[PDB]
Amino acid sequence: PVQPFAIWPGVWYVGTENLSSVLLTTPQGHILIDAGLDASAPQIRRNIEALGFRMADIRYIANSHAHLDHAGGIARLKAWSGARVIASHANAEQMARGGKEDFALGDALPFPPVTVDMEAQDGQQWHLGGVTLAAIFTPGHLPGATSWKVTLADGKTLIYADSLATPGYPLINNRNYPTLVEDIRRSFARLEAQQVDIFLANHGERFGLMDKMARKARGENNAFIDKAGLARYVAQSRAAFEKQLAAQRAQP
Numbered sequence: 674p675v676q677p678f679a680i681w682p683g684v685w686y687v688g689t690e691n692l693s694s695v696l697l698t699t700p701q702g703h704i705l706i707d708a709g710l711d712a713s714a715p716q717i718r719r720n721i722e723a724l725g726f727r728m729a730d731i732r733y734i735a736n737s738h739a740h741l742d743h744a745g746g747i748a749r750l751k752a753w754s755g756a757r758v759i760a761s762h763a764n765a766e767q768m769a770r771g772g773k774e775d776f777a778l779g780d781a782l783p784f785p786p787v788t789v790d791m792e793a794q795d796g797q798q799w800h801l802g803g804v805t806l807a808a809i810f811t812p813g814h815l816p817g818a819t820s821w822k823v824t825l826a827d828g829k830t831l832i833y834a835d836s837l838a839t840p841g842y843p844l845i846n847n848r849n850y851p852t853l854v855e856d857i858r859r860s861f862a863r864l865e866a867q868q869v870d871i872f873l874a875n876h877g878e879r880f881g882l883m884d885k886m887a888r889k890a891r892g893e894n895n896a897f898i899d900k901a902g903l904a905r906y907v908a909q910s911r912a913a914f915e916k917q918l919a920a921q922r923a924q925p
């Protein structure tokens with residue numbers, strides 16, 4: 674497995690090669706962003722413990738969006754930590770249903786249901802131990818998709834970006850999620866405008882995890898400082914999305 678490691682002081686990667694989970698540590702306890710698959714949860718716990726941190730000290734678990742590869746492990750990690758789960762309303766409703774009634778997937782990819790304790794509204798902030806966590810509503814991939822802005826105790830800004838992907842989604846006359854095109858285009862604009870020091874995302878290949886991890890492990894302390902990376906992720910996503918919409922318009 675990918676061994677857990679420090680992205681930056683107070684910021685730790687505890688996920689797997691593909692599925693992000695990020696631990697923000699503070700003297701007042703910790704914040705975990707995302708939790709992989711249900712099958713990932715034992716490994717994420719082991720990774721947190723291998724860094725010398727306690728599950729019991731995690732105060733909040735924040736979700737990007739309510740698909741099995743980000744929310745699947747939340748039920749278990751919540752039980753082990755006692756953390757309060759934070760998510761947007763739409764993600765909370767989908768988590769309560771274990772991923773079922775998904776606008777594009779239906780019931781094809783369910784996961785353990787979990788109760789969200791605290792809803793997040795756009796721009797809402799939580800403070801813990803010198804760190805500020807703020808929700809950035811970035812819908813499109815799902816109606817409740819959320820990116821997370823973190824102001825660290827040293828003043829650095831971290832963005833944890835959600836998915837901007839629309840895999841197999843009908844974009845024209847989608848009766849289950851009618852506004853998805855307008856939503857995702859606004860999400861591109863919202864993210865590319867963010868001031869950011871450290872760019873992370875909920876899949877390692879979206880932010881160059883493996884290459885940056887290798888450089889960091891070999892002494893490049895600023896490997897995860899990537900001020901233009903979020904803009905580049907948006908640009909790649911926009912190009913693919915606009916090609917997708919044009920392709921669907923050509924033969925609807």
Ligand SMILES: [Zn+2]
Nearest residue numbers: 738740814836
């Ligand atoms: Zn997803």
Ligand SMILES: [Zn+2]
Nearest residue numbers: 742743875876
């Ligand atoms: Zn994912």
